Design a binder for this molecule. Sequence first.
Ligand SMILES: *[C@@H]1O[C@H](CO)[C@@H](O[C@@H]2O[C@H](CO)[C@@H](O)[C@H](O)[C@H]2NC(C)=O)[C@H](O)[C@H]1NC(C)=O
Ligand SMILES: *[C@@H]1O[C@H](CO)[C@@H](O)[C@H](O)[C@H]1NC(C)=O
Ligand SMILES: CCNC(=O)CCc1cccc(Br)c1
Lengths: 30, 595
Amino acid sequence: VSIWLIVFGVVMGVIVVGIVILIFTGIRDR
Amino acid sequence: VLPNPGLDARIPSLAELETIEQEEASSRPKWDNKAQYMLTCLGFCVGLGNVWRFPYLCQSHGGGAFMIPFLILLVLEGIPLLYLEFAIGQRLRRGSLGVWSSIHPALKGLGLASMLTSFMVGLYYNTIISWIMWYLFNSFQEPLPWSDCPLNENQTGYVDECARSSPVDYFWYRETLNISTSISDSGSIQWWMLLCLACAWSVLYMCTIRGIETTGKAVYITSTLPYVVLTIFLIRGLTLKGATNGIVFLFTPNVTELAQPDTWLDAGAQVFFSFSLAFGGLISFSSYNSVHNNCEKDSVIVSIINGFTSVYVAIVVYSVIGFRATQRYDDCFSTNILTLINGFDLNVTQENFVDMQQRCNAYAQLVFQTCDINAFLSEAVEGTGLAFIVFTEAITKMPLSPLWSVLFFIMLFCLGLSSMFGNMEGVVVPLQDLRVIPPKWPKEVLTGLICLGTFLIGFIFTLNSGQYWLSLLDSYAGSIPLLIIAFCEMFSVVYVYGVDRFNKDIEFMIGHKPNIFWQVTWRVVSPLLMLIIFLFFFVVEVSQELTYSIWDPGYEEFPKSQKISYPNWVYVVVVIVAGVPSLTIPGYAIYKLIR
Ligand SMILES: *[C@@H]1O[C@H](CO)[C@@H](O[C@@H]2O[C@H](CO)[C@@H](O)[C@H](O)[C@H]2NC(C)=O)[C@H](O)[C@H]1NC(C)=O
Ligand SMILES: *[C@@H]1O[C@H](CO)[C@@H](O)[C@H](O)[C@H]1NC(C)=O
Ligand SMILES: CCNC(=O)CCc1cccc(Br)c1
């Protein structure tokens, strides 16, 4: 188990969440 | 001053500028606050200078020998061009590409070159953010992964490379880079480097999705953390033993270097980096202010903070350099001590040594490694080494090493990210003006197409040869192109658009013609300074031979540097990285005079 991989996993996951949230938020803007 | 026939009906009239503000609420974006604009300028100025380049040249020229020429050129060529850019963006209500099109139709190369340079510098600056976040990720372990050496397959001895060099050098060149011997020898795409690259461009997209709207809310944490953390690193910096030995070392400047055109050139090109000038993302940012905003006062506030943070960064850097140099000095006198004691069986201090060995003298059999603190302080790490080789090692000799690791690499991320926001604005906006995409497409698309296209181009830096590329690219990316662009902006606003016209519009916006300071800096001094630094570029290029440092372990003096000449194909890479952007300014100008 690489600690960098766990840290990356969390961070990359959190970013994706934001990304999709922002896309829909803009789509919601009508 | 030169022929510019038909300048009105290509530029908003001052009479219309009052009537172009309340109507243009839709179709052009708007700063939520005044503070949200000042943060976004500071972020782009403090993050593009101090994320890497500034702290490097300070330590690469000895400190005061670089800071002196810097603060001279920060006031004479910096402040003027930062005022000029904020003013011309707020008046012409266009981004960098629109401003040089409106001013003069054949002056398109300026805006285009600004977009190319902004693209190019942002391409390899997001790799440095990837490298920064690699370390950040590897910064959550009581024994920092660069604190110790790996063992042999037999585990009877430490790895050879890691033994000849340092645990820190090994983690950088082997565990992180997996560096090859030459730019020629380009292996596969280092996978763990690709993940970090993906992570970097991705968080960039997440913060520049709708543009200044979404980035404006990013620049609160991003433009403030670097500071809060830079101050924590001063209180810790100055408690370190060797600090105030290295601080004293930057304040006692080398004057021999003050007589080198090299020190002045690097100081020159750093003004355009520390002030985010000639990238054209500041013009676009001032183009979203009120027409009656004090753009003379904003320029002076931003500049005063930019000059102050340079000195505040050089202090936090020389604290740690001093601390490190003291450590290496003591560990050398201690060894010089151990040799004498282990050859004569003696009771010996850092004081009673030269007399001690004298009376003692088998003496010939003993070897004493001569060393003085001055040589340790003078040691210059090349490349990105000040973060990955000097700070990362000093952190391992500081209790709460992991905290000190995470704080230092979050403040370097923030600094790199806020730099990318302004670099993204200098490529996205000039594309929206060119109408490259169909208008129907939202902002997220164009942004995303740019975020994925470059991320793909960023694979050249995940190779084994990937570090040499980022080296030479930078060397020719932020040099002449910025110098030329920066000079042409000063020339085309004063001698093509007219300084006298430029003085009347500012008077419309702030209620006063600027001080004679501005007049002398804009008409005569800054263009003359930018010409002297533009020659100095060619004066240092001719004498020096095209070479670079390689990390060959099989090399006899593997620890010692190895400066080999680049292959003869590399001049194809050099002529494009520097020539293409610099020639778009004459190139388009000629094309428009024959169309
Ligand atoms: C200031 O810079 C000069 C130039 O690098 C230094 O002079 C050098 O010193 C080293 C060590 O004695 C010599 O090996 C070089 O050949 C010298 N270079 C030149 C061009 O003379 C000088 O020592 C520096 N001064 C300080 C205080 O660091
Ligand atoms: C480093 O590069 C060499 C040459 O391509 C390769 O053989 C080796 O497997 C690489 N190491 C890693 C960890 O990727
Ligand atoms: C990762 C590339 N960056 C560097 O090499 C130097 C950065 C750096 C070192 C120390 C203080 C500050 Br602020 C910035």
